Amino acid sequence: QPRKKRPEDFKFGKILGEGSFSTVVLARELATSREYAIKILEKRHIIKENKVPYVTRERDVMSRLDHPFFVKLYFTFQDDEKLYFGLSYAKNGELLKYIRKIGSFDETCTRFYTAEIVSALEYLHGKGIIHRDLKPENILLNEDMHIQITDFGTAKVLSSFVGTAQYVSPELLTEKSACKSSDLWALGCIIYQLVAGLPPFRAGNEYLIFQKIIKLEYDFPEKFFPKARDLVEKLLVLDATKRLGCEEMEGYGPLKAHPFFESVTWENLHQQTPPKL
Numbered sequence: 107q108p109r110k111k112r113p114e115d116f117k118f119g120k121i122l123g124e125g126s127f128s129t130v131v132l133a134r135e136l137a138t139s140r141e142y143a144i145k146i147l148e149k150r151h152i153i154k155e156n157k158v159p160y161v162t163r164e165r166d167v168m169s170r171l172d173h174p175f176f177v178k179l180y181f182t183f184q185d186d187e188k189l190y191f192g193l194s195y196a197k198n199g200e201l202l203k204y205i206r207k208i209g210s211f212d213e214t215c216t217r218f219y220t221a222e223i224v225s226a227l228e229y230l231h232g233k234g235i236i237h238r239d240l241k242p243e244n245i246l247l248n249e250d251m252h253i254q255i256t257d258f259g260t261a262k263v264l265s266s267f268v269g270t271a272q273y274v275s276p277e278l279l280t281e282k283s284a285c286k287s288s289d290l291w292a293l294g295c296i297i298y299q300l301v302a303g304l305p306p307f308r309a310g311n312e313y314l315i316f317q318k319i320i321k322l323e324y325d326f327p328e329k330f331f332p333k334a335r336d337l338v339e340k341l342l343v344l345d346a347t348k349r350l351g352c353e354e355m356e357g358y359g360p361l362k363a364h365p366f367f368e369s370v371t372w373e374n375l376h377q378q379t380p381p382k383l
């Protein structure tokens with residue numbers, strides 16, 4: 107392994123993302139002219155807020171990941187006040203930006219991108235890892251328009267916390283307990299949102315959003331692709347042991363075999379040419 111990289115190795119540029127405890131900044135390494143997305147975390151603030159476990163878990167998780175549909179951790183370093191993580195640079199930014207830009211996806215685009223998300227989840231779940239906060243903001247688009255999922259501090263590695271309100275599963279609001287199915291719940295929401303242009307549970311505030319979730323209070327627009335609707339209904343199920351794709355439903359085989367995915371070749375998605383948006 108090379109000697110530890112340092113801030114002076116980079117020409118920093120624009121801000122790519124902002125969070126409570128971190129900022130992501132585009133940086134060009136000078137020796138290589140390579141673009142990384144460098145996640146910068148201020149030690150003092152992290153310690154002051156008891157986030158050390160989350161930072162730790164993100165670093166450890168993103169190291170165990172080796173797959174085209176996941177943002178990669180290339181390196182780390184620190185100076186006196188800050189931690190730096192060198193991450194894949196997803197040139198095209200958030201899936202959310204495209205949902206907003208074009209409104210809603212047609213069937214072909216919805217099918218391809220849902221399949222990539224599914225295939226990524228299958229990989230993540232095979233390593234015993236749960237994202238716990240999957241959402242279109244976390245789902246980045248590479249320069250070639252394939253997905254790269256990021257943001258893993260809130261992940262759990264299988265042998266407390268609440269993600270974004272509209273993607274939260276009922277079992278979180280009723281038990282403080284999660285599992286792979288929580289990721290599948292969020293997948294159901296993301297599919298709905300690709301198709302309809304909006305997340306299925308919307309309300310004036312978080313409390314109300316939570317109410318609708320535990321009540322399964324949402325419904326399909328009339329233009330919704332039927333096969334996608336059937337898939338979403340097999341995902342947005344209050345009982346987590348009955349969500350298509352989870353272990354009690356015998357996993358990813360039956361999920362991938364869903365009629366909505368009829369025309370999909372699962373084996374080499376990352377090699378396929380994403381449909382034009």
Ligand SMILES: CCNc1cc(-c2ccc3c(N)[nH]nc3c2)nc(N)n1
Binds near residue numbers: 122130145257258
């Ligand atoms: C501040 C939000 N928290 C985050 C943000 C990102 C992130 C954001 C944008 C990115 C891009 N355009 N390429 N790579 C990126 C990584 N990644 C993690 N892990 N956590």
